[PDB]
Design an enzyme around this catalytic site. Sequence first.
Site, PDB file in Angstrom:
ATOM      1  N   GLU A  11      43.093  29.250  39.729  1.00 39.16           N
ATOM      2  CA  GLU A  11      42.759  30.397  40.562  1.00 39.16           C
ATOM      3  C   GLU A  11      41.682  31.341  40.011  1.00 39.16           C
ATOM      4  O   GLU A  11      41.081  32.083  40.777  1.00 39.16           O
ATOM      5  CB  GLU A  11      44.043  31.212  40.686  1.00 39.16           C
ATOM      6  CG  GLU A  11      45.170  30.426  41.364  1.00 39.16           C
ATOM      7  CD  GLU A  11      44.930  30.164  42.823  1.00 39.16           C
ATOM      8  OE1 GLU A  11      45.649  29.489  43.476  1.00 39.16           O
ATOM      9  OE2 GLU A  11      43.917  30.816  43.347  1.00 39.16           O
ATOM     10  N   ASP A  20      39.053  34.077  49.501  1.00 40.80           N
ATOM     11  CA  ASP A  20      39.458  32.787  48.952  1.00 40.80           C
ATOM     12  C   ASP A  20      38.660  31.602  49.551  1.00 40.80           C
ATOM     13  O   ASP A  20      37.731  31.778  50.317  1.00 40.80           O
ATOM     14  CB  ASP A  20      40.962  32.588  48.910  1.00 40.80           C
ATOM     15  CG  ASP A  20      41.634  32.298  50.232  1.00 40.80           C
ATOM     16  OD1 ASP A  20      42.812  32.200  50.346  1.00 40.80           O
ATOM     17  OD2 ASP A  20      40.841  32.039  51.213  1.00 40.80           O
TER      18      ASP A  20
END
EC number: 3.2.1.17
Length: 162
Positions: A11, A20
Site C-alpha cells: 500500500e 487509490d
Amino acid sequence: MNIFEMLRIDEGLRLKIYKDTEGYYTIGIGHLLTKSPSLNAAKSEADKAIGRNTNGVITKDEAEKLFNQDVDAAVRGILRNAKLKPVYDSLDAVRRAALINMVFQMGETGVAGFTNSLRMLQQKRWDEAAVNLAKSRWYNQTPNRAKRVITTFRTGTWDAYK
Ligand SMILES: [Cl-]
Ligand SMILES: [Cl-]
C-alpha cells in the site's frame, strides 16, 4: 517479515489525501476514506477518523494508528465471517498473512466471493488455487500486487516480498 511490513510494501504511505488505484479517496497506509467523488466528503471522513480538523493532512503517527486499527479490523472480520474463518484456521502463518492482505484490500465481502479459490486453499491445493485466483478482475487490475499475494499462497514463504 510480517503482515504489517507486508501491507506497508503493498500500500505505501501517504500523508495527504490521495486517490487509490480505483480512483477512491484514501490516506495513510491504504486507508479508504470514501467512495464518493467529493473531496469534501473525503476531508470530513478524515477528520472523523482522526478526531481533529485535518485539512486532509495527517502525521506519520496518525497514519500508523489507522493502519493498526485496520489490520485488527481485517483479522476480526475474517474470524467473524463463516466462509472465511475455516479457511484461515486451516492455513499456516504465512498464508494467513496472505488472506489478511486480500481482506484489507478488498473487504470481507469481496474475498468471501472467491468461493472456489477458498475451497482450494482449504484443501491445500496450492498450484490450483494460484491458477484460480489469477482469473479475477483483482489480478487483472493490480497484477503486481496480486502476483505477490498469489505466490505467497502457492509457496508459503515470503519470497515475493524479499
Ligand atoms: Cl476509522
Ligand atoms: Cl499492482
